[PDB]
Design a protein around this ligand. Structure first.
Ligand SMILES: COc1cc(C)c(C(=O)NS(C)(=O)=O)cc1-c1ccc(C#CCO)s1
Ligand SMILES: [Zn+2]
Ligand SMILES: [Zn+2]
Length: 585
């Protein structure tokens, strides 16, 4: 193993030869531990609170989920316990018949995914444009420095030789340049999966990449029209820790479709940074804080360019295998059999594969599957054996599916079908309201002025006006925030890092105009393009559904908040100062 990871550990060991030691009280059980060095502790035990959002959501000061969200421990202590609880495990090797079906399905799926698209290298200028559009950080400064690109070039020359010197995953500007450089090289070799939308629904059938939260419910409703059994949406317990050596070798098959110069760099990423990895994690000790240097051959590195796409790929494969078991194509005897008949798998993929992909909505580890019947509920042999054990349910207990697409969980949301006052139907995204309020009350970092805090508050308010307008409390709080924040101040930072977010709320354009563009003009499931001219015609969930999804409507404290909200708005305005404000109430 040292022939692939040895150089990286050697450079770390040499840079910290003063404090480098082999701490034999290290807690690693499934990861190879190489050594430790002294570091300055980073992170926080609590998240910073957005005062503008907090002042305008007084009834949620007394809400447990809202309080919990504001916690989140990122200190070496928090790092260590998350590591222990999840990441320090070993997934049993799938059986030989299971490995054979996975291999056949992976080959077929990669061929299907690359039927129209050809892989390509991503560039310095693409990465630069992405970093700049995200910053609008020291990454924009690094990208502007020529010396960063020279370090990138030197690392790439090692990769071309089948060597790695500085690509270390993290759980001086040199170590920052080496981190950003590692990320650029991964983007260079595997970025095409995202940049050329390989997991778009048109290209992958099951995929939803590029679709947007506002489209996911409509796609779930379209899946519900397909004849078959219930809709299943099982959660995997820590998916990234369940990515096996066999999954990694199956994902690597995409290199067969690459040009020689591309294949060489992508092979370097796979072999040196995915199938082998050097990881840095902080750990508190009685003497202070230390950085541990660890390594392993499997699992997925969560904060990587290829993670979403490769998790989507492996989940599509795993769900097709489960569909085959449900249909009787794969038996218990087949999974144990190294010599299992490849022909029946090939025949099922070639005749039914695409139709079975159309029965799914897959986004990374998130899946919704509508099998041909309910035999799928009990088809658990391959799923458990591939290592994709379902979260909080005994291993052999049948899955529970839904016969209403509106009850189906997907991507931390569920979706409602609303009837507008004019008779038109809308499909809207929704989640427990406490989660929406709790998240909006969290500020992103310390040393933030009232202006930056208010502008992030406005971003949350405008996201609610666009995606969660159907929640009575959120429309009211959104109107309150936008009345409290100067009209000409541009929303800043980001409300989410979700791939399903297109950030149409990041504007000073009228929110009703943005609402019409997204929900009416651009909406392919909205045949009638008649605009909505007033928010009074922008619908709400039925009051009982709003309440079932966490609304405080009907409570006295909520009525008291709604009545007194001009007072709280005025208090925010007075502390912001003499600026131009508008009355949205
Ligand atoms: C599936 O969508 C999401 C999934 C998750 C888990 C989270 C989240 O909680 N993010 S977080 C941890 O607060 O950063 C956020 C969203 C989105 C919010 C708004 C969106 C939009 C749009 C249309 O353009 S998409
Ligand atoms: Zn490297
Ligand atoms: Zn709901």
């Amino acid at each position: 193993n040292m022939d692939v990871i040895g150089e990286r550990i050697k450079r770390i060991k040499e840079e910290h030869n003063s404090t480098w030691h082999y701490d034999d009280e290290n807690p690693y059980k499934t990861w190879a531990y190489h050594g430790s060095y002294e570091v300055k502790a980073t992170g926080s035990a609590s998240s910073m609170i957005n005062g503008v959002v907090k002042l305008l959501t007084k009834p949620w000061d007394v809400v447990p989920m809202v309080t919990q969200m504001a916690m989140t421990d990122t200190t070496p202590f928090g790092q260590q316990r998350v590591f222990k609880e999840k990441v320090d495990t070993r997934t049993p090797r799938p059986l030989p018949g299971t490995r054979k079906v996975m291999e056949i399905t992976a080959e077929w799926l990669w061929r299907t995914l690359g039927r129209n698209k050809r892989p390509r290298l991503c560039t310095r200028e693409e990465f630069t444009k992405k970093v700049r559009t995200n910053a609008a950080d020291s990454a924009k400064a690094a990208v502007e420095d020529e010396e960063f690109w020279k370090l990138v070039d030197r690392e790439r020359e090692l990769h071309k030789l089948g060597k790695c010197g500085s690509c270390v995953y993290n759980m001086s500007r040199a170590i920052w340049y080496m981190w950003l450089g590692v990320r650029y090289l991964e983007f260079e070799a595997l970025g095409f999966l995202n940049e050329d939308h390989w997991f778009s629904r048109e290209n992958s059938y099951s995929g939803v990449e590029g679709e947007g939260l506002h489209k996911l419910g409509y796609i779930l409703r379209d899946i519900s029209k397909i004849p078959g059994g219930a809709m299943y949406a099982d959660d995997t317990a820590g998916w990234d820790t369940r990515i096996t050596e066999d999954d990694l070798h199956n994902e690597e098959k995409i290199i067969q479709q690459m040009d020689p110069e591309h294949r060489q760099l992508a092979n370097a990423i796979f072999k040196l940074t995915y199938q082998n990895k050097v990881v840095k994690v902080q750990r508190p000790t009685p003497t202070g804080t230390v950085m541990d240097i660890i390594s392993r051959k499997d699992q997925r590195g969560s904060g990587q360019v290829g993670t979403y796409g490769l998790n989507t790929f492996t989940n599509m494969e795993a769900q097709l295998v489960r569909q085959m078991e449900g249909e009787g194509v794969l038996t218990k005897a087949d999974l144990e059999n190294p010599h299992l008949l490849e022909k029946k798998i090939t025949q099922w993929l070639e005749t039914k594969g695409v139709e079975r992909l159309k029965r799914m909505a897959i986004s990374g580890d998130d899946c919704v599957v509508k099998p041909i019947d309910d035999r799928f509920a009990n088809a658990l042999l391959a799923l458990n054996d591939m290592g994709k054990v379902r979260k909080d349910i005994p291993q052999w207990q049948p899955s529970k599916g839904w016969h209403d697409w509106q009850q189906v969980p997907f991507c931390s949301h569920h979706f409602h079908e609303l009837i507008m006052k004019d008779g038109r139907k809308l499909v809207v995204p929704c989640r427990p309201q406490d989660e929406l309020i709790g998240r909006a009350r969290i500020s992103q970092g310390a040393g933030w002025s009232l202006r930056e805090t208010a502008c992030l508050g406005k971003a949350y308010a405008q996201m609610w006006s666009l995606m969660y307008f159907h929640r009575r409390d959120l429309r009211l709080a959104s109107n309150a925030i936008c009345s409290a924040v100067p009209v000409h101040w541009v929303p800043t930072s980001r409300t989410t890092w979700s791939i399903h977010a297109h950030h149409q709320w990041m504007t000073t354009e009228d929110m009703l105009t943005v609402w019409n563009r997204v929900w009416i003009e651009e909406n392919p499931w909205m045949e009638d393009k008649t605009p909505v001219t007033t928010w009074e015609n922008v619908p709400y969930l039925g009051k009982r559904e709003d309440q079932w999804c966490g609304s405080l409507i009907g409570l006295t404290s909520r009525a008291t908040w709604a009545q007194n909200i001009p007072t709280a708005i005025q208090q925010v305005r007075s502390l912001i100062g003499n600026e131009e404000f508008l009355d949205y109430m």
